[PDB]
């Protein structure tokens, strides 16, 4: 098992998934005016994550570095897309497309969480195989409560 106490990437991924889960929990009752803050808090935890990953990359071999950068780029694309579904939903607050728009917000935010986990995995592999990891379900639990 992996020791997560000092592990800023793991902790930042957990915070990301928690912000996505807060978006989901607030969405149904939120007025359109309140959509910006909950997507921004997701993006803020992505900024922290990418920050802690960046700090790590120069210690990894070029192989791992490239593939980790692939995962980060995807996360950014995921946020860009959540921002797009957020705007659609705002513009449809007073139409009968509001519910569908919000469903598509949730899909986009869920996709982001899933890929945050996938970044965690590629980081762990890169550490493991570069003798950088430290040995000794919660992440998946958050994803499960979200999957509902």
């Amino acid at each position: 098992n992996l020791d997560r106490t000092d592990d800023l990437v793991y902790l930042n991924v957990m915070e990301l998934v928690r912000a996505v889960l807060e978006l989901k929990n607030e969405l149904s009752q939120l007025p359109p005016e309140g959509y910006v803050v909950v997507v921004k808090n997701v993006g803020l935890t992505l900024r922290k994550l990418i920050g802690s990953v960046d700090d790590l990359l120069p210690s990894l071999p070029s192989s791992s570095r490239t593939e980790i950068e692939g995962t980060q780029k995807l996360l950014n694309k995921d946020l860009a897309e959540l921002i797009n579904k957020m705007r659609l939903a705002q513009q449809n607050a007073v139409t009968s497309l509001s519910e569908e728009a919000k469903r598509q917000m949730l899909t986009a935010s869920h996709t982001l969480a899933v890929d945050a986990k996938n970044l965690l995995d590629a980081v762990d592999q890169a550490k493991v195989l570069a003798n950088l990891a430290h040995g000794g379900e919660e992440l998946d639990a958050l994803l499960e409560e979200l999957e509902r």
């Binding site: 803050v37 921004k40 993006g43 900024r47 990418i50 950068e69 921002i83």
Partner: peptide
């Protein structure tokens, strides 16, 4: 300030301008 951090700051700058 890699490409990912720069691309992300770009996305975040948009959200902040529409609150």
């Amino acid at each position: 300030k890699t490409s990912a951090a720069a691309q992300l700051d770009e996305l975040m700058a948009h959200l902040t301008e529409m609150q």
